């Protein structure tokens, strides 16, 4: 899978869409040939093969010089909780995604200002914090469409920061796929069918 890394090219449906598509295939190259792409894809394939989950998030960070960029990051699947009501692979009928993050102190200061109270830890000397970032699918009442909202919160502390529709379209940044969903709604992976052979060896 390392040398067969798949990209997606775009093709026109009509004849007039070609000047669109050959534009967008030129604009996806700065998303393709970035440094994080191959790392996120190989981490994704390792998580899909060892376990059953593959989680890749996207971001639209814009640093200083009007330069909009699409960051890509593969998420560790053990620090990622899906809605229990979603039964299918790719997690499309999911209403919420939770990720439990470790956050350092100055990254928590940059993430939100000092006006709200942070429940830090004291693990050795550095005051880290455990922050749960939840993404909720809720339909609006002004427009009748679903939008995704972000809540950075801590258990037994409350909500640190609540933002609604923080992507100009109400799109969830996570792309999830489960390999081998089974009964009782678990991901099965390639590990369980080859595990007793390894134990016998």
């Amino acid at each position: 899978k390392i040398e067969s890394i798949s990209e997606i090219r775009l093709s026109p449906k009509q004849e007039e869409d070609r000047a669109l598509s050959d534009l967008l295939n030129s604009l996806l190259q700065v998303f393709i040939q970035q440094e994080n792409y191959d790392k996120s894809m190989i981490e994704r394939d390792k998580n899909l093969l060892i376990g059953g989950l593959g989680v890749i998030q996207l971001w639209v960070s814009q640093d200083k010089d009007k330069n909009v960029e699409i960051e890509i990051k593969a998420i560790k699947p053990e620090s990622f909780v899906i809605d229990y009501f979603s039964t299918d692979k790719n997690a499309l009928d999911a209403r919420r995604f939770h990720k439990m993050l470790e956050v350092s102190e100055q990254e928590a200061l940059l993430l939100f200002g000092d006006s709200v109270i942070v429940n830090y830890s004291n693990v050795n000397h550095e005051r880290i914090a455990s922050v749960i970032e939840s993404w909720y699918k809720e339909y609006n009442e002004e427009t009748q469409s679903y939008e995704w909202n972000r809540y950075l919160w801590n258990r037994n502390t409350g909500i640190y920061k609540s933002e609604k529709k923080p992507f100009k379209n109400g799109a969830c940044p996570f792309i999830v796929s489960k390999l081998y969903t089974d009964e009782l709604n678990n991901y099965y992976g390639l590990f369980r069918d080859i595990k007793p052979m390894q134990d016998f060896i």
Binding site: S4, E7, S26, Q33, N67
Partner: protein
């Protein structure tokens, strides 16, 4: 992606073919088809497509082929490309310079042959009259 963000990434022709708007890329729903392929750089893919297209178009229509090789060589990732392109420009400049230098002799020969073929008309008409 803003319009100046797009025009910093793509070429001038690729930007001018799409924006004939409202300064935003507005794709419709039934416009694009997603096709998976191997992850390769754009100039290498265009080079391979140019190579197979010139090997296809050689027997069926040859006169289209020598007008495509600057457009093929513009899409080459080789370090010798900036030399080959100015070599093509110098060869085309020398060719059009020789053509525009030799063209007065050609139009002189054309007018002179026209005058000879008219002189044959008046000669045979005068012979028929006498």
């Amino acid at each position: 992606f803003t319009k100046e963000q797009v025009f910093k990434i793509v070429d001038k022709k690729l930007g001018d073919r799409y924006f004939k708007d409202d300064n935003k890329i507005r794709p419709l729903k039934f416009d694009l088809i997603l096709k998976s392929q191997l992850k390769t750089e754009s100039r290498d893919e265009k080079w391979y497509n140019w190579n197979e297209l010139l090997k296809i178009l050689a027997p069926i229509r040859p006169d289209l082929v020598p007008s495509l090789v600057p457009l093929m060589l513009n899409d080459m990732d080789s370090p010798i490309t900036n030399d080959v392109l100015e070599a093509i420009q110098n060869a085309n400049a020398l060719q059009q310079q020789n053509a525009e230098a030799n063209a007065p002799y050609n139009q002189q020969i054309q007018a002179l042959q026209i005058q000879k073929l008219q002189a044959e008309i008046m000669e045979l008409q005068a012979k028929a009259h006498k």
